[PDB]
Structure formats: structure tokens, C-alpha cells
Amino acid sequence: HLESTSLYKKSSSTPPRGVTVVNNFDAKRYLGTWYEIARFDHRFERGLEKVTATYSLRDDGGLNVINKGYNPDRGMWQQSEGKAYFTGAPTRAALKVSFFGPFYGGYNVIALDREYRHALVCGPDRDYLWILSRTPTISDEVKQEMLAVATREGFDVSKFIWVQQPG
Amino acid sequence: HLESTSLYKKSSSTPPRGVTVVNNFDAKRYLGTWYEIARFDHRFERGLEKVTATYSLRDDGGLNVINKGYNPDRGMWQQSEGKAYFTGAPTRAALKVSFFGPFYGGYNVIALDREYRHALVCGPDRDYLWILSRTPTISDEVKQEMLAVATREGFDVSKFIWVQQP
């Protein structure tokens, strides 16, 4: 049901001890819009609800990233744009991504279903984790499975904020 | 994010040393109803709850001002009707306001969000300050931004009364 992963380490881009990263990735199936179902309390997203990320293919072989979110303390929709590059082979879902302004960090897909409907992504350390989905909600069954992989890879899943989404 | 301002100083209308006043004001967007979220304990408003200020355009280029509130001591709603005129250009949010007789008070918009949803308004010295909003409550983030501008402009934010609103 899930894509194959293997242990993967790159200095400064992956968490200590490495993490299991997707190793037969097909970037074209990753394109388009994902809803952020859950995130750790990342400073660059603080406050945001109804968050999505939209990926598109660039001529230089990277991805454009469009981040959208609603700030309920301002009552406003916000958008920001970034870029993503593979750090090695494009079959390995390890990227560097601009998370705020010109600052890039590691972006590692550590679980992904074979139909590219749901993903667990971690940043360069264990303070950065996301659950992404093609739909604004996920099943309890998908939630359990994603939480289980995160726990196995050493993350503390009680740090998740469950992001408000439609439905 | 907030509208641009510039320093405006005029004795009797602004506080001493002047205050930063909005300088790209579009009065049509300021029209309609605002809730008074907070005020410094002004004697003409003492005890009032559920206070609103309503602005409408006059033919002569001023604003009609209606200040309304519930007075628990009287067990009655109360309102005062005044007129406000720009002291300078209509893009500068500094007005003079009269309700009784040939006497005028300064009204200076010193913070305003670009969507005209919240504003910080001062009078002729630092005993006169208001937070206005299009909604009867504001978020903590918006509250903190207004309190910071107030402090920047020399006001003592411990003087705010947080007005009773729905």
C-alpha cells in the first residue's frame, strides 16, 4: 500500500540517524495541490489554518511551490512562493525546499501511498514534520498509519497541530 | 499590515510633539459602524457599554459622527451627534470634531489597517485614545499591534478600559 523506502542520510538535510525516505519516487505524480492535515509548530507557519502546498514542474528540473493559508487572527488568506530541488537522484524523495524567503532546508518524503494520495514529510530535523493529503480530510485509518511511521522514525507525534480544513 | 503615516503636529489638535497620522486616507472606506473596543477613561464616556461610532459623509465634505452607547446608570441608550472636518488634506486622517457649540476636539487616526477593519485614534493629548474595530471583538494579534503603536507614540496603555461588547 505504501511506497518503498530505505534509510537515508545527508549531512544538514536529514534528521540525526537518518530517516527512511522514498526510493522509487515519481515526481510527476507528486505535482499539484496538497492539503496540510497536520504539522509540528513550525515558526514559518505559525497561526495558519486551511493550509495547502501546490507543486509544479520547472524548466530547470526543480519545482515551484505555492503555499496558501488562512490567518484567522487577521481574517485573511495569505500566499507565498518557493522552490524545491532534488539533492540527488530524482527517484529519491529528498529535496531542498525554500521554507521562508531565501532560506532552504531539507524536505524528505518518509511515507507515501502508491497512488500519491497521502504523504508524511519531514524536514532537516525532528522539529519539522507534515502530513499531506490530496483531500482536506483523511480517514482514521490513514491517520493511524502515518502516525505509526512517524513514531517508528523517532518523531514525537504528540507535537502535531491538526490543521483546520474544510470538512 | 497598516497604512502609511507621517508626523503631524498642531497644538490643540494633536498631542505634544505630534503623532504619526495616516497619510493616504480614503474617507469613503472609513464610513459606517465601528465598535469601541477600548478607550482611556474619558469623562464623557464614563460607564458606557456597547459603544459604537458611526460616520457618514456630508455634502459639505465633512463627516457626521454619531457616538452611541448604553448607560447602565440611566438604564438607557444614549447618543451624541457631531460633525467632523479635515484640518488639512482629506488624505490626512486628522479631523476636528464638534458636538456642542463652537468647541472642537482633535481626532487623529494614528494606526489603520489597509482593509479598514481596525483603527487607533487619538485626541489632542495623551489622555485621549481609542481602539475601534468593525467587529465587536478583536484578536490578540490585532490588539498587540495597536498597543505597540500606542506605546511607540508615547501613550500609556495601562490606561485602557476594555469596553463591554457582544
UniProtKB/Swiss-Prot annotation, chain B:
Major localisation: membrane
GO biological process: DNA damage response
Induction of synthesis: By starvation and high osmolarity.
Cysteine pairings via disulfide bonds: none
Keyword Transmembrane helix belongs to the record: no
One Pfam family it belongs to: Lipocalin_2
Compartments, as annotated in UniProt: Cell outer membrane
PROSITE patterns: LIPOCALIN (PS00213), PROKAR_LIPOPROTEIN (PS51257)
One term under GO cellular component: cell outer membrane
InterPro entries: Calycin, Lipocalin_ApoD, Lipocalin_bac, Lipocalin_Blc-like_dom, Lipocalin_CS, Lipocln_cytosolic_FA-bd_dom
GO MF annotations in UniProt: lipid binding
SUPFAM superfamilies, sorted: Lipocalins
UniProt membrane topology term: Lipid-anchor
Highest taxon, organism lineage: Bacteria
Biological role: Involved in the storage or transport of lipids necessary for membrane maintenance under stressful conditions. Displays a binding preference for lysophospholipids.
Entry-linked NCBIfam families: PRK10477.1
Quaternary organization: Homodimer.
Protein family membership: Belongs to the calycin superfamily. Lipocalin family.
The protein, known as: Outer membrane lipoprotein Blc
Species of provenance: Escherichia coli (strain K12)
